[PDB]
Amino acid sequence: CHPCPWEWTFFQGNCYFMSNSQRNWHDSITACKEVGAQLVVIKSAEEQNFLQLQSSRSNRFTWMGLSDLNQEGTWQWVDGSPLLPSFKQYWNRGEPNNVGEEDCAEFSGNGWNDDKCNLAKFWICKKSAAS
């Protein structure tokens, strides 16, 4: 028994995969579902620190499963859970600024940034480690 499928990274009971191509927010969600996963929904500060490193390391702008599409200002993860105040510190300073309507969150630099959902970016999928 191995926790994750080949090519997927194991971290604290969960499996992660970062794309090698760029897609918009909605397409990234579909990309993850197609591999039995979900555009990464962060559940803890530790997980955030882990994921942020992968983006700041490779110096890549990456999608996460978070948006305020349904209600401007109200950020919600793709699984329905609301963005806890515990995570506000992660937005880069000045973010989220919603310029030109930015309703999708990405890992950008050392923190998060809200950007155009239709912009193509890399994405990270997450799914629980095998039983």
Ligand X SMILES: CC(=O)N[C@H]1[C@H](O[C@@H]2[C@@H](O)[C@H](O)O[C@H](CO)[C@@H]2O)O[C@H](CO)[C@@H](O[C@@H]2O[C@H](CO)[C@H](O)[C@H](O)[C@H]2O)[C@@H]1O[C@@H]1O[C@@H](C)[C@@H](O)[C@@H](O)[C@@H]1O
Q: Among residues 97, 99, 104, 118, which one has the least CA distance to residue 69?
A: 104
CA distance linking residue 18 with residue 4, whole number of Å: 14
68 near Ca ion, judged by CB under 5 A: yes
Report the alpha-carbon angle 89-45-75, nearest 5: 55
Shortest distance in whole angstroms from residue 1 CB to ligand X: 41
Torsion sign over Cα 19, 36, 26, 94 = negative
Shortest distance in whole angstroms from residue 74 CB to Ca ion: 9
Question: Which region among 22-30, 42-50, 80-88, 94-102 touches Ca ion (by CB under 5 A)?
Answer: 94-102
Which residues, numbered 57-96, are part of the site for ligand X (CB under 6 A)?
A: 95
Residues at the site binding ligand X, with contacts judged by CB under 6 A: 95, 97, 99, 102, 108, 113, 115, 119
Give contact residues for Ca ion (rule: CB under 5 A). 68, 97-98, 102-103, 113-114
